[PDB]
Design a protein around this ligand. Structure first.
Ligand code: NI
Length: 341
């Protein structure tokens, strides 16, 4: 049964609630983004209206075979009426196609559902600037002050400089990047761009990327692995055994692998600066874990909330333990006392 924090009061709507069967009272199912913990349950046999971004709706039709007549894509930054309720979709700064949803309830209440997001000061000048928000359904993934990480731009600078040095030292080095979902495409695209190469990958992953409306993509990716020196592999294969096996398959074209695992946070964040990050090495294989996050840090989250000044916060992540829930509530009260709302 569907948990309360997936239900929008005063409407017929749910958010990211496809694994519960037919939800009683639901007339429209919203999907914030195409990540499996959120789409779990969708398939070609789904026959209720699904509301989403254009990019999410391309992935629904092509990857999950949802029939077209049930996909209702909405443009971003545009007031739309759904089953008699005004809604707006906003960019969530998460993975491609990911949105936050503003609901303007018939009684005057305004609710923001962040989906998954990485808060940014640019959001303070979207359509959120223009009215009061009463209730915030908040992505609390990293809601504790230990969670610090660098900007995406610093992490990509590290990656490009590391790859360009290695390959200029050794033109027979292969670069490998791990993936298991959409998101984080800048990692492998920025490295292929500095090297003058396309990114090579499986037909299944090429198919996924072709649904993303990324400009000039035909110029940047390929299924011809032999023509590429940046390869994408499943995240599970980014270990010394998996990479040794891959290097065998390349037929003596290469004699070294430099590999990247874009993690979110890891405890090596609490001690070490990005500049100081080092790989794990075995023979001619090196693996870098790089802290490329598509979720808010603690400080980014706190800034957004202190700017928005909601009357009520409903966390959507870390809600399964009493210790987590008590920790989050304590920070919410701090933020409200410091800012004065
Ligand atoms: Ni996500």
């Amino acid at each position: 049964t569907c948990p309360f924090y997936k239900k929008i009061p005063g409407t017929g709507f749910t958010v990211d609630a496809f694994q519960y069967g037919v939800v009683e009272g639901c007339t429209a199912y919203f999907l914030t983004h195409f990540h499996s913990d959120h789409y779990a349950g969708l398939s070609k046999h789904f026959t209720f209206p699904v509301y989403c971004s254009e990019i999410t709706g391309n992935l629904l039709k092509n990857k999950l075979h949802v029939q077209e007549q049930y996909i209702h894509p909405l443009p971003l930054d545009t007031e739309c009426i759904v089953n008699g309720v005004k809604v707006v979709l906003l960019d969530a700064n998460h993975c491609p196609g990911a949105v936050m949803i503003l609901f303007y309830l018939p009684n005057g209440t305004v609710i923001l559902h962040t989906g998954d997001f990485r808060a940014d000061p640019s959001m303070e000048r979207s359509l959120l600037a223009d009215q009061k928000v009463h209730m915030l359904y908040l992505d609390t993934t990293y809601c504790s002050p230990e969670y610090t990480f660098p900007s995406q731009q610093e992490v990509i600078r590290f990656a490009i400089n590391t790859a360009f040095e290695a390959v200029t030292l050794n033109p027979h080095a292969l670069v490998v990047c791990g993936t298991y979902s959409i998101g984080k495409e800048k990692v492998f695209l920025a490295i292929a761009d500095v090297l003058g190469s396309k990114v090579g990958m499986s037909q299944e992953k090429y198919k996924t990327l072709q649904c993303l409306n990324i400009p000039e993509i035909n110029s940047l990716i390929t299924t011809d692995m032999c023509s590429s020196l940046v390869h994408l592999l499943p995240m599970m294969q980014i270990n010394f055994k998996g990479l040794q096996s891959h290097l065998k398959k390349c037929g003596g074209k290469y004699n070294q692998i430099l590999a990247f695992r874009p993690t979110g946070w890891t405890h090596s964040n609490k001690f070490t600066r990005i500049a100081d990050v080092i790989p794990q090495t075995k023979g001619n294989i090196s693996i870098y874990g790089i802290p490329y996050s598509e979720h808010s840090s603690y400080l980014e989250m706190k800034r957004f909330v202190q700017w928005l000044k909601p009357q009520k916060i409903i966390p959507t992540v870390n809600v399964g333990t009493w210790k987590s829930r008590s920790t989050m509530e304590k920070y919410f009260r701090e933020w409200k006392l410091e800012a004065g709302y």
